[PDB]
Design an enzyme around this catalytic site. Structure first.
Site, PDB file in Angstrom:
ATOM      1  N   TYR A  20      62.924  25.170 147.087  1.00 41.22           N
ATOM      2  CA  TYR A  20      63.483  25.727 145.864  1.00 41.22           C
ATOM      3  C   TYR A  20      63.335  27.268 145.908  1.00 41.22           C
ATOM      4  O   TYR A  20      62.271  27.811 146.281  1.00 41.22           O
ATOM      5  CB  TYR A  20      62.759  25.163 144.630  1.00 41.22           C
ATOM      6  CG  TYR A  20      63.232  25.771 143.356  1.00 41.22           C
ATOM      7  CD1 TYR A  20      62.880  27.093 143.003  1.00 41.22           C
ATOM      8  CD2 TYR A  20      64.092  25.068 142.533  1.00 41.22           C
ATOM      9  CE1 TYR A  20      63.405  27.694 141.836  1.00 41.22           C
ATOM     10  CE2 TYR A  20      64.624  25.660 141.371  1.00 41.22           C
ATOM     11  CZ  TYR A  20      64.275  26.969 141.038  1.00 41.22           C
ATOM     12  OH  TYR A  20      64.815  27.547 139.926  1.00 41.22           O
TER      13      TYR A  20
ATOM     14  N   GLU B 214      69.444  30.015 141.153  1.00 41.05           N
ATOM     15  CA  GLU B 214      68.670  28.851 141.468  1.00 41.05           C
ATOM     16  C   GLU B 214      69.339  28.180 142.643  1.00 41.05           C
ATOM     17  O   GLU B 214      70.512  27.786 142.572  1.00 41.05           O
ATOM     18  CB  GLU B 214      68.606  27.877 140.303  1.00 41.05           C
ATOM     19  CG  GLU B 214      68.192  26.489 140.745  1.00 41.05           C
ATOM     20  CD  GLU B 214      67.865  25.616 139.533  1.00 41.05           C
ATOM     21  OE1 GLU B 214      66.819  25.870 138.868  1.00 41.05           O
ATOM     22  OE2 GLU B 214      68.676  24.691 139.248  1.00 41.05           O
TER      23      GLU B 214
END
Ligand SMILES: CC(C)(COP(=O)(O)OP(=O)(O)OC[C@H]1O[C@@H](n2cnc3c(N)ncnc32)[C@H](O)[C@@H]1OP(=O)(O)O)[C@@H](O)C(=O)NCCC(=O)NCCS
Ligand SMILES: CC(C)(COP(=O)(O)OP(=O)(O)OC[C@H]1O[C@@H](n2cnc3c(N)ncnc32)[C@H](O)[C@@H]1OP(=O)(O)O)[C@@H](O)C(=O)NCCC(=O)NCCS
Lengths: 287, 388, 388, 287
Positions: free
Chosen positions: B109, B197
């Site tokens: 991530y 993101e």
């Protein structure tokens, strides 16, 4: 009172524009010591009976103003604020809405390093009832008094002003910290000023969803604020991840809900009120 | 504003970051033709909607035949995709992203937001990719690594390396990761993003980092200086009323309830919604009138609030503003007739001519109650929807 | 490194700043052909050399015929232009800039350097254009306006406006000036410049700002990340020995004197030059050996110092370094024979084997005196050139 | 002594490179408490018997080092220095030559804001004879003593070290501020430290052409330095506008000549010496 008083000399950046004109007229009628304004390109003229300067440094040299209120469109604010910081202005009140977060990110770092105080942006302003008015608030609902008010919202502030005036408490100074995600000043900054201000006997802290300034203020109040504080947080019914008007009124990553803020303030011993209509009642209780 | 995944990937590509080879397709034919342009399948096909959770909703499939690409495109184009991140009405799928399959070795991530507490753009990385970052933060905070961009210096390679090493990356993945950090940090600053993101940022089996998904959020206050981003806005992804409200200088957010709220002020709008909720009501919307409560604007406000069939009453709460209370009352009256407002309206006015504006409302004969203060206003609109 | 005026103007153009229409020409034919490409004359023709004061030296003329452009080009190409800013040998003119004449209404000065006292890039502007900025600073400081670029924010429009208003500009000239400030500030930061000087920055009679000349200096320490600037280096503008020295890790600057100095250390090099001067000598050069005083490097050093016919002796002053004193002595000996150093050499060695290195020199039989300390070394080289 | 002493724990960034290795070996032989090094990509190995870390923060957490010496090529220095500042290192000694002025412009602002001390760049380093050596100077010419030395030049410093050792004065601490136009620390910064250091009885300040740090130091010394100061400025014979080796050794705009610096120091009451060979003699005079 804090921040401003009857002696504060103020210049207005964006003085000749619509809002700058209209609100400087209001400040002037209130008796605020507006001494001049700044509109690049219109230096040397006079407006509202005051000198207009091309730059803030000219304005400052000519008038000795320590405070500037800004009514400059968002695209030019960073430039306006940095100019004011550079000209030695020690108090900047930026009314402007829509300033890119990244601009404020940088401006905030600058303000803190230069030791310049900025209220805003996206704020109705600052008013020390009976002495000085800078901003767009209606001055006929205030009453010189003892309650200090800090808020991320102009309209909610007014409600609290109405109530503290109706209960006769009146206001020491009302400070709108503004609705942006990165304000020049936050609750903790304003809270400390009220705690140290003899004229302020109680504080009304009004917040809303988003960020964690309220939660941090809570922890601050618990350890450093002795005066009674009444808190109100708007947005209990706001959905998450949606901007509710204010650029700062958005719950990011599920954090910063109104409930968390109420809870945090309750735990720090702050007198919170679930209904914004009960701020005056809550003050009566603690005064 | 949000960007589509495909638009995020185009941006990444523009910044030399890596993403699967893919084509945004508006017709099944374009989608099927993407297959051979991509190469040997299988191929990942993805509905493009702003909301996340598309996978869980069936909007992301790995198929292995042109026929399936086309079937999936046929199935979704023009249809609405509901995910746990959209309301029950979902978001229209007008583009299917068809991209090369990626051999996933590991999911990471990498994301960034403006952290308000530290007042910095903060990048965060985690080995826990493919999972909602919130979940990971709640349960294994120690697995989330962060660095704050220094406004004075811009992003620095050591920050990218810091995250890379905390993720246990090594060798060329450290340089690749650092490069991605530097590019995403640069995109964040240059395009005035509010959010990045990459979930998942994938380590491919061939040993390379690749952005498998991309969620980008732009700072709307900066669009005046982001012409490219400005054009990427996809209004179909949002309640069209928000844009209508905005072009009329109203900020509108629809809610579930049935008591419409029209207030000047974001804070007062939320407070009004809350007080309506406190007194037993269910707010149908947030609507900050901001702009001058003119007859035209108030009229628009009603049209927008009322376009929601569930609204049974409307609470107007106006404290201050640039228009005198009596003019606002005249405008509310005009709006009510002209919009054909057939629901009860409760009005709370504060400011110049509050009581005269109240009189005008009372004397109009329209179904509009002038309330006496906030609490009263709340109780009355709540009562006004009793039984509806 | 310095750029030519024409290269500075190309850069300005690239940043949307304005400069006269012009062509850099390497042959008289190109110069004459520039005339009709520019348009109606007259035309300004300018020798392109790094040094300033070209006007005073005849290197800038306003001509009105193709024939004159060609004559001027014929006169200067391949010739050296001496100005008060070059040594008596001038700088080779390999390009003639031919540009449109400009109708000058007023001459201003706009420049920027890294101010070491304030540790900021400082832009300065003055209404006193067309004059050496130093003169104006000495006599009418009150006419020099300055702004420091804030490292945290980058240049800001208010700074450009500040200078513009202090220059008494008004109307569109303020915006034009601000735009030029913003572009030059941006060039300064992005290209790692050490210096910008637009003298004169002209207000044309048609009411526009235009860069009539441009002097740009690049930070040499940043050329590794300025590939474009890297290619613009014109080595013909400098003493070729400097580049030779540099590719051998020596820093060489030729002086007027006759006592060559070879020292490890910039500070010691200057100190050695000064002490030689103090004791009656005239230093011929600065040469900081920096690099390891190897036999090869010391040999190069001698070749370079000695390429100057006026050198009658060479003082080698080595304090420390990565090579033991005796190895340096062996190298000085090898250099002296191999380079055919036919001048007396005085050597001062400090460090490991100082006295043994001294012995080796004394025993080589070459004309090399090992000195006993600095003062002695100075006195001896001074004495060594007595009569030469 | 100032800056460093026998207790200073030091890590080396660029530890495994040629110069970092070679000079860490020298520091180690001198007894400097090198506790580790940082070379991205080589974390977890050991070099010169010390742990190598991938990042400075790892190094700091593992060793508690408060000082870092940097031997990282110029292109990566800004990154190295900012990393060290970020890791909490309080003393950075940057040996590296060739760092772009603009990089140092920014680094300097950072150092000052973070309160981190940096010596350099382009410096031979720092040495407190008998206690701690960080840098590339030869340690066998020094003698624990009472003269504090600050210099923009490594080699000139050595001359002064030789002299103060030969006259028996010895050195408290020798600080090379480096030859770059914007050093992390300047004369005034180091001067104040010597004035406050009991072990330092006299100061040798060595400067050269370019900038105005010496002139400013002069004014500073006159008003705030009570200890005797002996000054030496190199470059009296340097041409103007030409780099003399050091990126900072250039006289820009005709300002900052050696004569102006001597003059400025003389007027502030500093004992200057025209010949670099007479520094020891000048100290004898004032001690
Ligand atoms: C700032 C804001 C009020 C400006 O609106 P406005 O007055 O209609 O804008 P105008 O164009 O009329 O006036 C702006 C003036 O700023 C001037 N200006 C622009 N850049 C400037 C600068 N750097 N310094 C000073 N003045 C500047 C313009 O010249 C213009 O004046 P002019 O008309 O004399 O040329 C508006 O953009 C805004 O933010 N409104 C929301 C305010 C708000 O609601 N705040 C929160 C309340 S709780
Ligand atoms: C800094 C300098 C000494 C480096 O030279 P060097 O040791 O030959 O360079 P090397 O490539 O051998 O070593 C540099 C190391 O830094 C490392 N490095 C690069 N970026 C780094 C970073 N961000 N952090 C830490 N180390 C880093 C490299 O990995 C390399 O080590 P490695 O070989 O283990 O991979 C040289 O460039 C310099 O400035 N020399 C002049 C020194 C001087 O004269 N100063 C003034 C004296 S008065």
């Amino acid at each position: 009172s804090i921040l401003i008083d009857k002696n504060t000399k103020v210049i207005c950046q964006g003085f000749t524009g619509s809002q700058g004109t209209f609100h400087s007229e209001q400040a002037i009628a209130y008796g605020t010591k507006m001494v001049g304004g700044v509109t690049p390109g219109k230096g040397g003229t006079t407006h509202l009976g005051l000198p207009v300067f091309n730059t803030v440094r000219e304005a400052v040299a000519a008038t000795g103003a320590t405070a500037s209120v800004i009514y400059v469109p968002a695209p030019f604010c960073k430039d306006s604020i940095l100019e004011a910081i550079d000209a030695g202005i020690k108090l900047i009140i930026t009314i402007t809405e829509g300033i890119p977060t990244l601009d404020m990110l940088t401006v905030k770092v600058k303000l803190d390093e230069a030791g310049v105080r900025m209220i805003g942006p996206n704020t109705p302003g600052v008013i020390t009832p009976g002495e000085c008015k800078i901003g767009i608030q209606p001055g006929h609902i205030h009453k010189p008094g003892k309650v200090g008010i800090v808020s991320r919202s102009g309209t909610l502030t007014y409600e609290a002003v109405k109530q503290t005036t109706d209960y006769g408490f009146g206001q020491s100074t009302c400070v709108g910290i503004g609705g942006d995600p990165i304000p020049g000043s936050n609750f903790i900054d304003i809270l400390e000023m009220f705690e140290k201000d003899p004229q302020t006997e109680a504080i009304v802290m009004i917040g809303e969803i988003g960020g964690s300034a309220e939660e941090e203020a809570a922890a601050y109040i618990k350890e450093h604020v002795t005066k009674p504080v009444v808190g109100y947080i708007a947005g209990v019914t706001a959905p998450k991840g949606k901007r509710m008007g204010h650029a700062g009124a958005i719950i990011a990553g599920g954090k910063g809900t109104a409930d968390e803020k109420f809870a945090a303030l309750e735990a720090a011993g702050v007198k919170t009120v679930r209904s914004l209509a009960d701020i005056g009642e809550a003050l009566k209780t603690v005064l | 504003m949000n960007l589509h995944e495909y638009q995020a990937k185009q941006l990444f590509a523009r910044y030399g970051l890596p993403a699967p080879v893919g084509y945004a397709c508006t017709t099944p034919r374009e989608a099927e033709e993407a297959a051979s342009k991509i190469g040997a399948g299988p191929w990942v096909v993805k509905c493009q909607v702003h909301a996340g959770g598309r996978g869980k909703a069936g909007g992301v499939k790995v198929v292995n035949s042109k026929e399936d690409i086309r079937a999936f495109a046929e199935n979704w184009l023009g249809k609405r995709l509901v995910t746990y991140q959209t309301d029950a009405n979902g978001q229209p799928v007008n583009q299917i992203l068809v991209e090369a399959a990626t051999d996933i070795a590991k999911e990471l991530y990498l994301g960034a937001v403006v952290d308000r507490s530290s007042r910095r753009v903060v990048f965060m990385a985690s080995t826990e990719g493919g999972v909602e970052i919130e979940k990971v933060a709640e349960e294994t905070p120690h697995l989330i690594h962060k660095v704050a961009l220094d406004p004075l210096t811009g992003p620095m390679p050591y920050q990218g390396r810091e995250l890379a090493f905390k993720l246990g990356l090594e060798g060329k993945l450290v340089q690749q990761f650092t490069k991605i950090f530097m590019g995403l940090a640069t995109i964040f600053l240059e395009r005035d993003l509010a959010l990045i993101e990459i979930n998942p940022l994938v380590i491919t089996k061939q040993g390379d980092l690749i952005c498998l998904d991309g969620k980008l959020g732009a700072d709307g206050n900066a669009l005046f200086r982001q012409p490219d981003l400005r054009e990427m806005r996809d209004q179909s992804q949002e309640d069209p009323r928000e844009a209508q409200a905005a072009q009329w200088e109203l900020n509108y957010v629809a809610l579930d309830g049935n008591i419409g709220c029209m207030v000047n002020g974001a804070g007062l709008a939320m407070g009004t919604m809350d007080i309506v909720k406190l007194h037993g009501g269910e707010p149908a919307n947030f609507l900050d009138v901001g702009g001058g409560a003119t007859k035209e604007r108030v009229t628009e406000a009603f049209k927008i609030i009322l376009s929601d069939d569930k609204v049974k009453a409307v609470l107007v709460n106006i404290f201050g503003g640039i228009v005198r209370c009596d003019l606002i009352a005249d405008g509310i009256i005009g709006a009510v007739a002209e919009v054909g407002v057939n629901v009860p309206v409760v009005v709370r006015l504060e400011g110049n001519n509050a009581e005269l504006g109240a009189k005008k409302l009372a004397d109009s004969g329209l179904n509009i109650i002038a309330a006496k203060g906030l609490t009263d206003a709340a109780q009355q609109v709540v009562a006004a929807v009793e039984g509806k």
